[PDB]
Design a protein around this ligand. Structure first.
Ligand SMILES: Nc1nc2c(ncn2[C@@H]2O[C@H](COP(=O)(O)OP(=O)(O)OP(=O)(O)O)[C@@H](O)[C@H]2O)c(=O)[nH]1
Ligand SMILES: [Mg+2]
Lengths: 360, 396, 272, 29, 10, 38, 98, 86
RNA sequence: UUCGGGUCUUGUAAUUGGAAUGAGUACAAUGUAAAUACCUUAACGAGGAACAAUUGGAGGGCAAGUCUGGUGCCAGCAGCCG
């Protein structure tokens, strides 16, 4: 009757996958042994977001809060505003909406309010330049995340507007069996309620690592001051490696804490980006889960994606097992014929998903 | 279509038609080619060649015949490949929706001569490779990684300690490949490789736009064929499932005992796979007209037997008009000679799925009039509707 | 004075500018501001300089009482005498009376914009884009090309402007190369001026003229401080090795002029 | 109260309709 | 809208 | 059901704030639409 | 231009395709059974006295057919065979007409 | 020949308006998108998206009219002497 | 063009009678290598002569019907829907 899961592991992913596949699911034993059992507030707010963009969905939480029953409805979207609790930033909520947005009856226009950055969740630039380009490859032509107000922790005060005009039947089949040649490194260096000097010092650290490279390095300085700067001082950097060849991107992101050295964070993220490039074959680790899901929900056709051995980590294992339990689809991996690198080709047949909610 | 072939048969001798005409008909069937149909190419289906009841006889006795029966259905698959894993939802015409308990491929009982000779003419029974460790759920994912060598809510992936990485990337070697009299040939060759990188795609024909699309479909189909061929037969079946033409045994559970008892081999058993939307139940917004040859117009809240996808059922539709696109107003009857927007509750289905409606399915009430009552195309699927009607208050 | 009355060209100019929300744009002589209001929508901060106070006030009246009003900044007076604040991009309807000084001031200004979309008369536009061997190749084309690259976006008909000017104008994009090539501005211009007295002359013919030969001789003796016939001999030589003396000035590319400069520096003679 | 609310609703519908109509007539030409 | 969250948490 | 006439406008706090903004907002600019001796 | 059509995908397998489903549909007594016997004999050289349910026969070196005699008296049958029949042999009584 | 991409005037409140009878169609031969006229809103009905339509020379700029849909004449459907095969 | 002018058995949505005949069916004969058909012809074959002629074009009129706009009752669009 219900596909059963355990724990809070991959809570968002299990919800969206059930939402896309249309199969009811049950998630149990959520933080049973902890002093504070059951869902966190942000997880509860996350479910409310699903109810807003869907119609006919039934969501039941246990008396203890440790078990949820989910019966997905259809994706309808529409215009709405969501208030994000301070426990999580907007990116924690924007990311799952990204999976569902292109397959809705009506275009998604959701206004997200709350803290806008964190250490463990996707930033604004990460979505804008790190995940959304991947969809452009997969056929979501029009997608935009407008930054109205930046809100740094702990008080936040920021605002972001998610708009996806493109509604598609399903993602196009993916054919990427090569290592993209990344042409340039770009990025956004931002700060709030503080002097512009911090942004300048931070790019200085990033360039120091990246000056040895043979590609041009151009990092934008986005100093936010005044009313639109939020309620707290904060500052962070994003560095994106771009392949104009086939429009591929790899990125790294962190934010700075009070008392931290702006130069040090810049050097860390630059050094962080190089590791991501070393570990990446066609998409970065932070981008891989979105790519895998999109191929799974493609047409009844075999899509190919090149993945490095480093990307096959503990997280990648659960993602495939989670996908199988809901979709019954298995990702077949084969070695590449090359000897320079030990990469492997991930071949996935789409489940023939179609956007039946959209009126014709 | 105009010019359609029409064969003529005069009489019957010894229970056979004239040999000459049958010869012509057989040839015409032999060389025939079939158009691709949208529905047939989007769902898996099979026609049951034989029927069998697998319920244990003791169970039929200790509980009685009323007990639900386990039955096995055999036949050739058609259309899209059927998934190998059990649990797939499927509909049997005139029976209901069931879930496949088991599925297994059997040798072809009527192998075509070309197939047989690579390796009776009539068959009428009725008459540590990481890839494995991913799906061994018993092994923990952490255990899997180490043998061959935390959570997705944290979007940022795991990175090593900052200082160790600084030493790691002090030099830029090992990533140079990712970034963009005899030595002269080397420079141009490197420069040649650079050019195709930086302008290659824009520069890398078919006469008509139609041929371009057919090329894209065919190329993708070829890519499928190569990929499956490399894979092992077990691996192939595991991903695609059972391809069309495969002879498959399929076992069902919780089948009504009536179906076992009420078995006439004349009446066919048609099996059709269901997509996720087909399972859903809700309001169906559709565009519908009275059929031209039906004598009578239809009425709102009047039963009508619809045929959507693989399923046939009766519902109470409500005929509507947009009222110059200001409101969804209820009608009393279908328009005499044009469609109208109709709403009815039933299993959802993808838009653009055509359907036809009939008011009488029993022979006893057949009469002589045309039995096809309505035809239409489903326009939208939804979980609610806001049909309204004009109410007038009258005073003096 | 003309005013543009085509909305499509104004929208196109903004789109080609492709202003990022992060970047700040600088506008010169907005006038009516129909192009301006679109720029405010896609620009975080906009700085506008207007020669006439009344236009600026009317522009204030157009952005009047709007959320974009706080972002918009209004400045008055000729842009030259003022020192322009930093701006990432410049898209403006400059008068052509000041186009030629303007384009160079943008280049000369430290930290110049990466991209700028400007309108010039057709003849000026061709001169900006004229390439070696082209009929319209001139001294100005060689100078601007070496500092920055300029490409022609579109051509705007005279009829679109009202009252229609007699000469057509074409919107053009210029991007300043970063880093700027390491060559002294005065020395480059000194080389270009002598060799472009008549593009169709031989480069040697320009040098052998008596008046400039005085100037080169005066310049050479200054370098010694740091025989007029001797200087004539040295110039006659260095042209022969470079072979540029035979070649026409118009045909010679920017790279060729560099071979002219370095060879002269070897002789010890510097233009300026 | 509902009188005022409906008025806002119908006005928004009319504006949305007219705004769409310019778009269709814009694309077609 | 159709459907809703059934919150029986105390 | 339909209504013949405009509903009478309602002075909510937001309406007052919006109105009172304009009344204050104007006065900075000293833009008063006033009769002046001719 | 008559060559031009809407692109579509045919999911027929490249190797070992299934037998084509042939539906013999017509009013009662129009000769559906005798037609199936006649076709089967010519193709296989064997006569089937009684036919019930699907009959799969070899029809060529690499082509096979399945014959189904739709119940003439049932409309519900006429629907579901119509959704799967690759070929229909529509029987018409010439003397009686349509 | 062409594919029906969208029915631009389906929503238009005004019945039998010139906008209602316009349908965007993409020519199969070249893939260029154009518009076609339909004889009337009733005939606008038989057309649905992704149907093959044969076009013939005829709001300005619309120079084509639909003469067949799915290989059958629109007039035949309008007089209702035939039924569209799907 | 309003102003009006010119002209006489016209109209019926009314009833009603018995004469003719081939499309078709068909003994036969003729026709033909043998047949079909034509030309012939016993016998049947007409009042909605339902033994049911088509393809295009122009123009109305109607409602407790529906949409849009506004110096009230109007106008535009249109109306298989009351
Ligand atoms: N004279 C003549 N009789 C025919 C012809 N075709 C069929 N028949 C007769 O029609 C009768 C019915 O034949 P069937 O084959 O049983 O037809 P059916 O479709 O199977 O009928 P049901 O199975 O009862 O639905 C038989 O007695 C045949 O002799 C024909 O061309 N000429
Ligand atoms: Mg029979």
């Amino acid at each position: 009757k219900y596909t059963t899961f355990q724990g809070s592991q991959n809570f968002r992913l299990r919800i969206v996958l059930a939402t896309l596949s249309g199969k009811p699911i049950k998630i149990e034993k959520i933080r049973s042994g902890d002093l504070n059992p059951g869902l966190k507030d942000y997880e509860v707010s996350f479910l409310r977001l699903i109810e807003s963009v869907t119609n006919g969905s039934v969501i039941e939480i246990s008396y203890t809060g440790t078990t949820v029953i989910y019966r997905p409805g259809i994706i309808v979207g529409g215009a709405s505003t969501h208030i994000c609790p301070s426990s999580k930033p907007v990116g924690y909520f924007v990311e799952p909406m990204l999976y569902l947005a292109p397959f809705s009856k009506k275009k998604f226009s959701i206004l997200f309010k709350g803290i806008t950055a964190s250490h463990n969740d996707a930033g604004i630039e990460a979505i804008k330049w790190g995940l959304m380009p991947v969809m452009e490859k997969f056929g979501v032509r029009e997608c935009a995340l407008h930054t109205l107000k930046r809100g740094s922790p702990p008080l936040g005060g920021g605002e972001v507007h998610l708009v996806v005009d493109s509604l598609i039947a399903q993602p196009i089949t993916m054919h990427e069996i090569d290592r993209p040649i990344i042409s340039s490194i770009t990025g956004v260096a931002y700060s709030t309620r503080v002097s512009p000097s911090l942004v300048n010092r931070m790019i200085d650290g990033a360039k120091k690592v990246l000056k040895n490279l043979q590609c041009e390095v151009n990092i934008t300085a986005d100093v936010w001051r005044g009313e639109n700067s939020g309620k707290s001082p904060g500052w962070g950097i994003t560095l994106v490696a771009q392949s104009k060849q086939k429009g591929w991107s790899y990125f790294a992101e962190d934010i700075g804490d009070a008392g931290s050295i702006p130069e040090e964070l810049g050097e860390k993220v630059a050094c962080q980006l190089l590791e991501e490039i070393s570990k990446s074959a066609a998409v970065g680790r932070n981008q891989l889960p979105l790519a895998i899901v999109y191929m799974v929900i493609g047409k009844e056709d075999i899509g190919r994606l090149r993945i490095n051995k480093e990307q096959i980590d503990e997280r990648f294992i659960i993602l495939l097992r989670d996908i199988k339990k809901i979709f019954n689809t298995e990702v077949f991996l084969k070695p590449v014929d090359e000897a320079d690198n030990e990469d492997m080709i991930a071949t996935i047949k789409g489940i023939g998903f179609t956007n039946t909610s959209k009126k014709i | 279509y105009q010019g359609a072939k029409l064969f003529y048969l005069s009489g019957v001798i010894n229970g056979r038609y004239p040999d000459r005409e049958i010869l012509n008909l057989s040839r015409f069937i032999s060389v025939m080619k079939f158009r691709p149909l949208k529905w047939r190419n989007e769902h898996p289906y099979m026609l049951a060649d034989r029927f069998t009841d697998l319920t244990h006889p003791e169970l039929i006795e200790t509980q009685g015949l009323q007990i639900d029966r386990k039955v096995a259905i055999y036949g050739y698959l058609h259309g899209t490949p059927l998934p190998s894993a059990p649990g797939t939802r499927v509909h049997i015409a005139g029976v209901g929706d069931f879930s496949v308990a088991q599925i297994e491929k059997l040798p072809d009982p009527c192998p075509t001569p070309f197939y047989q000779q690579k390796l009776k003419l009539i068959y009428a029974p009725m008459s540590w490779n990481i890839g494995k460790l991913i799906y061994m759920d018993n092994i923990s994912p952490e255990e899997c990684i180490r043998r061959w060598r935390v959570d997705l809510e944290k979007f940022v992936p795991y990175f090593d300690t900052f200082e160790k990485l600084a030493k790691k990337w002090k030099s830029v070697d090992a990533i140079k490949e990712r970034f963009l009299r005899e030595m002269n040939a080397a420079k141009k060759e490197k420069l040649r490789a650079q050019f195709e990188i930086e302008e290659g795609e824009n520069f890398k024909e078919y006469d008509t736009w139609y041929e371009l699309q057919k090329a894209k479909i065919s190329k993708q189909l070829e890519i499928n064929n190569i990929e499956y061929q490399e894979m092992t037969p077990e691996q192939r079946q595991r991903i695609e499932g059972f391809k069309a033409g495969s002879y498959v045994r399929i076992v069902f559970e919780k089948v009504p005992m009536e179906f076992v008892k009420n078995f006439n081999p004349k009446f066919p058993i048609v099996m059709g796979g269901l997509l996720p939307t087909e399972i859903k139940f809700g309001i169906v917004k559709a565009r519908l007209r009275r059929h031209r040859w039906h004598k009578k117009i239809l009425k709102t809240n009047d039963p009508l037997v619809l045929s959507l996808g693989w399923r046939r059922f009766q519902t109470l539709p409500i005929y509507t008009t947009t009222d110059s696109r200001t409101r969804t107003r209820m009608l009393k009857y279908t328009p005499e000679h044009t469609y109208c927007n109709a709403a009815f509750y039933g299993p959802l289905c993808s838009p653009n799925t055509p359907f036809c409606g009939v008011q009488i399915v029993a022979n006893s009430d057949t009469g002589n009039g045309f039995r096809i009552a309505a035809t239409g195309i489903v326009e939208e699927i939804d979980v609610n509707i806001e049909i309204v009607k004009k109410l007038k208050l009258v005073g003096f | 004075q003309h005013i543009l009355k085509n909305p499509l060209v104004a929208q196109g100019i903004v789109d080609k500018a492709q202003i990022r929300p992060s970047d700040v744009v600088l506008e010169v002589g907005p006038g009516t501001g129909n192009l301006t209001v679109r720029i405010l929508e896609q620009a975080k901060n906009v700085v506008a300089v207007e020669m006439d106070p009344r236009m600026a006030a009317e522009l204030t009246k157009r952005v009047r009482g709007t959320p974009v009003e706080k972002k918009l900044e209004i400045m008055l007076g000729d842009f030259m005498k003022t020192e322009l604040p930093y701006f990432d991009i410049c898209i403006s309807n400059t008068p052509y009376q000041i186009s030629s000084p303007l384009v160079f001031k943008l280049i000369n200004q430290p930290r110049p914009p990466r991209v700028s979309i400007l309108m010039f008369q057709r003849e000026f536009a061709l001169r900006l884009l004229a390439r070696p061997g082209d009929s319209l190749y001139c001294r100005l084309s060689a100078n601007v090309q070496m500092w920055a690259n300029v490409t022609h976006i579109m051509k705007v008909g005279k009829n679109n402007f009202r009252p229609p000017p007699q000469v057509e104008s074409s919107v053009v994009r210029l991007e300043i190369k970063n880093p700027r090539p390491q060559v002294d501005y005065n020395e480059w211009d000194g080389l270009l001026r002598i060799v472009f007295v008549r593009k169709n002359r031989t480069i040697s013919a320009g040098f052998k003229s008596t008046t400039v030969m005085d100037i080169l001789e005066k310049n050479y003796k200054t370098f010694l401080a740091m025989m007029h016939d001797v200087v004539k001999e040295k110039i006659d030589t260095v042209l022969k090795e470079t072979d540029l003396g035979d070649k026409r000035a118009g045909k010679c590319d920017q790279n060729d002029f560099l071979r002219l400069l370095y060879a002269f520096h070897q002789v010890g003679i510097h233009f300026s | 109260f509902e009188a005022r609310q409906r008025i806002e609703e119908k006005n928004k519908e009319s504006s949305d309709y007219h705004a769409k109509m310019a778009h269709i007539v814009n694309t077609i030409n | 809208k159709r459907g809703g969250v059934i919150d029986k948490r105390f | 059901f339909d209504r013949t006439a405009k509903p009478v406008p309602v002075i909510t706090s937001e309406v007052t704030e919006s109105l009172e903004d304009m009344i204050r907002r104007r006065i900075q600019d000293s833009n008063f639409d006033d009769l002046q001796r001719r | 231009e008559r060559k031009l059509h809407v692109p579509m995908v045919d999911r027929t397998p490249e190797d070992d395709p299934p037998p084509f489903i042939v539906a013999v549909v017509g009013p009662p007594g129009t000769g559906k059974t005798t037609l199936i016997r006649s076709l089967v004999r010519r193709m296989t050289k064997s006569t089937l006295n009684d036919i019930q349910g699907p009959i799969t026969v070899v029809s060529g070196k690499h082509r096979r057919l399945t014959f189904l005699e739709c119940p003439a008296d049932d409309l519900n049958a006429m629907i579901d065979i119509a959704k799967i029949a690759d070929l229909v042999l529509l029987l018409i009584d010439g003397n009686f007409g349509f | 020949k062409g594919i029906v991409l969208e029915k631009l005037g389906i929503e238009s409140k005004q019945p039998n308006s010139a906008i209602r009878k316009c349908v965007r169609v993409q020519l199969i031969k070249n893939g260029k998108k154009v518009t076609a006229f339909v004889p009337n809103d009733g005939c606008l009905n038989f057309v649905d998206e992704n149907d093959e339509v044969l076009l013939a020379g005829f709001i300005p700029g619309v120079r084509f009219k639909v003469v067949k849909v799915s290989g059958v004449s629109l007039l035949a459907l309008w007089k209702e002497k035939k039924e569209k095969p799907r």
